[PDB]
Amino acid sequence: IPDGYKNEIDQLVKKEFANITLFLEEYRRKYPRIDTSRYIPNESSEVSLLGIVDSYLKHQEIVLDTLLPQTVSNQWRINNDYIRQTCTIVEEMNIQQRKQINDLEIYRKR
Amino acid sequence: STLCHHSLPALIEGQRKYYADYYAYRQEIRSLEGRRKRLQAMLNSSSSI
Amino acid sequence: MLCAISGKVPRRPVLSPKSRTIFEKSLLEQYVKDTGNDPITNEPLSIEEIVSIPNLLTSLQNEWDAIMLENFKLRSTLDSLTKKLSTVMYERDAAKLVAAQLLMEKNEDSKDLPKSSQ
Amino acid sequence: PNLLTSLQNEWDAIMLENFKLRSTLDSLTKKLSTVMYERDAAKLVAAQLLMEKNEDSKDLPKSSQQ
Amino acid sequence: SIPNLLTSLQNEWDAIMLENFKLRSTLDSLTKKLSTV
Amino acid sequence: MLCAISGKVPRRPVLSPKSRTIFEKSLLEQYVKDTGNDPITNEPLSIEEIVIPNLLTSLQNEWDAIMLENFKLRSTLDSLTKKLSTV
């Protein structure tokens, strides 16, 4: 009985039981360390010149040189093909485990 | 999402575990001789009566 | 396709000749210096044997958050298994005593039937 | 340049720690699976043993009565 | 602490970006501090 | 992704432990049966012998490229500086 004998035996087993890094782990408490929230805002009228040039121009020039297209979609789709080779390998192992698992149960059945 | 989320959790989280605990075979195959050998001796005494 | 240490997608994968398994070079090079042996198989292995804004602020912050809360939660998972790996073994041994107690009970009841005939 | 090299060196430990933590995770939990299977398997021994012990009593008491 | 090491690397990249900027505008100025001559 | 011997997409990849390269099992097996050797390096090999980080490496490319950007201005400064001293 998948509802009586298991419940019965469980009670009998129950009755016999009645008889018988520092920085990382601390951050886990649930707060990430704040980063530099400075570069994005700034102010023309406000304080500090370096922020204008020591924050925005050079990074924007590096951005415009970095922000690209020369290769475009070819570099992306080349990596997409690699992901498909990686995926099929896992499912082949899913099969190999599936066959040997059923094979062991098959021997028990006899 | 297909791998390291679904192909891995069926593989890491189930079939390997179930394969290692698919047997069950090593502990069982041995309990049977013990089961039968007790029954065989229990039968021998019944035959005497 | 992945490293067999960190769980990375290696930039410079290297394979060991004792146990055919691909590791990222920096991670395997660290292991040999710590203790000169293959991490998986525990077999003798040497180094020669082998064959700005969001990036600074938002992205780097998330990476150290994801590492921190993951290992802490992983440490919590390891504790639960040790917490009651014990509830498994205790309940198992509890069942063993039931079988041993019933094994004396059954055959003795069955032997009383054989004696009853006389 | 060395801050990035230091960032690598600390990560190199992070990967080494995660490996040993995962090995004990699967290796220990795997013993959990073998126990749980064998426990409910051993539990079925009692269910069978219980009913047989019960049959002997009715049989002997109805026989000893007459 | 480690969370401060995060802000140090932020400041060091912040400093080098300006240290590279200041070095190029000076180069351009000398071109006409030379072209005017 | 490719097999070095044939140039096809191997359906059963097995990596050798003498010359690290991904060969198709059916192809390399015939190569071993011909003569016990690895096809690339011609070193001895038998059938039994056959079997955050990305973000950090990115920051190296950033600084390694910017360091060359400095040389373009350091070297040009040394020529414009002497197009000034002689002037």
In the structure encoding, which two tokens stand for residue C46, read together?
């040497």
Among all residues of chain A, which has the CA nearest to that of B12? A94
Considering only residues 47 to 86 of chain F, which have any Cβ-Cβ distance to chain E shorter than 8 Å? 66, 69-70, 73, 76-77, 80-81, 83-84
- Closest listed residue to residue E3, CA positions, set A33, C53, C110: A33
In this structure, CATH architecture of domain C1-51? 2-Layer Sandwich (3.30)
Whether the upstream peptide bond of residue B24 has omega within 30° of 0, thus cis, is yes
Method used for this model? cryo-EM
Domain residue ranges of chain A, discontinuous segments joined by +: 1-110
Cβ contacts of F24-27, under 8 Å, gap ≥ 24? F25/F50, F27/F3
Three-state SS across chain A? Answer: CCCCHHHHHHHHHHHHHHHCCHHHHHHCCCCCCCCCCCCCCCCCCCCCCHHHHHHHHHHHHHHHHHCCCCCCCHHHHHHHHHHHHHHHHHHHHHHHHHHHHHHHHHHHHC
A87·B15 Cβ contact <8 A: no
Considering only residues 2 to 41 of chain B, which have any Cβ-Cβ distance to chain D shorter than 8 Å? 12, 17-18, 20-21, 24, 27-28
- Closest listed residue to residue D51, CA positions, set C106, C95, A1: C106
Most F CBs within 10 Å, among D2, D3, D4, D17, to test the F interface: D4
C57·E17 Cβ contact <8 A: no
User: Cα(B49)–Cα(B42) distance, rounded to whole angstroms?
Assistant: 12
- Closest listed residue to residue D49, CA positions, set B24, A12, B43: A12
H-helix or E-strand spanning residue F14:
strand F13-15
Rounded to a whole number, what is the distance in Å from the CA of C112 to chain B's nearest CA? Answer: 11
User: Cα(F52)–Cα(A34) distance, rounded to whole angstroms?
Assistant: 18
List of residues 6+ apart from D48 with CB closer than 8 A: none
H-helix or E-strand spanning residue D63:
helix D2-65
Quick check: C39 and D19 in contact, CB under 8 A?
Answer: yes
Quick check: D14 and C67 in contact, CB under 8 A?
Answer: yes
User: Cα(D33)–Cα(E17) distance, rounded to whole angstroms?
Assistant: 56
Whole-Å CA distances, A58 to C58, E13, E16, E25: 19, 11, 10, 11
Residue type, A50: L
CB contacts of C117 in chain B (<8 Å) are 49
Partner A contacted by E30 (CB < 8 A):
no
Give the number of beta-carbon pairs within 8 Å between E and F.
24
- Closest listed residue to residue C4, CA positions, set F51, B36, E13, A40: F51
Angstrom resolution of this structure: 10.0
Whole-Å CA distances, E37 to E23, F66, F85: 22, 32, 11
CB contacts of C56 in chain E (<8 Å) are 9-10, 13-14
User: Cα(D11)–Cα(D14) distance, rounded to whole angstroms?
Assistant: 5
Angle, CA of F26, F28 and F33, to the nearest 5°: 95
Can you tell me which residue has the tokens 């023309």?
Answer: A44
Please tell me which chains touch E, using 3 or more CB pairs under 8 Å as the contact test.
A, C, D, F
